[PDB]
């Protein structure tokens, strides 16, 4: 099916959505999903999925760095949640020539986008507490 679509002008979107068996190793998964990734033009991955693929522990250590004596920016003076933007070099282990766009999502809170020539983040929000008795995040 992928091949037939490309013949007729199609563009392929791989929304990963990893299943339970595939969360065991980074190595077993990278191999199983490889052919699909390289035949894909637009890809969506979650924040937890992207880190799983590359250096998950390294990212975890980073978010728990609290500076010892003085803060380096006024931002670190304020104790707020982390919203790291992954630099383009970090994602280079996973780029290929036919990738037009890559989206990494952190809930509805942040959406990061990566393109062959540009990068960035779109700010968002979430208010599940406005309706406390009818809230489900399922879809």
């Amino acid at each position: 099916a992928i091949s037939l679509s490309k013949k007729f002008g199609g563009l392929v979107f791989f929304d990963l959505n990893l299943p339970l068996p595939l969360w065991r190793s980074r190595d077993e998964t990278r191999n199983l999903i490889k052919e699909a990734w390289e035949q894909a033009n637009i890809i969506e991955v979650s924040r937890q999925e992207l880190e799983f693929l590359l250096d998950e522990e390294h990212y975890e250590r980073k978010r728990n760095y609290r500076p010892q004596y003085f803060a380096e920016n006024f931002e670190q003076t304020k104790q707020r949640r982390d919203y790291y933007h992954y630099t383009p070099a970090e994602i280079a282990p996973l780029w290929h020539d036919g990738l037009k766009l890559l989206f990494v999502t952190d809930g509805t809170l942040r959406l990061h986008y990566y393109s062959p020539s540009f990068d960035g983040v779109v700010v968002g929000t979430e208010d599940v507490l406005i309706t406390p008795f009818t809230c489900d995040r399922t879809g």
Partner: peptide
């Protein structure tokens, strides 16, 4: 006092031991 309280505002942009003194004959 900690980091939450103090911050670095500005990013912006021959020497050694000469010796030890010798005691003195003329103390006065």
């Amino acid at each position: 006092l900690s980091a939450a309280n103090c911050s670095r505002m500005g990013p912006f942009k021959s020497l050694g031991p000469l010796g030890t003194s010798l005691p003195i004959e003329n103390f006065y």
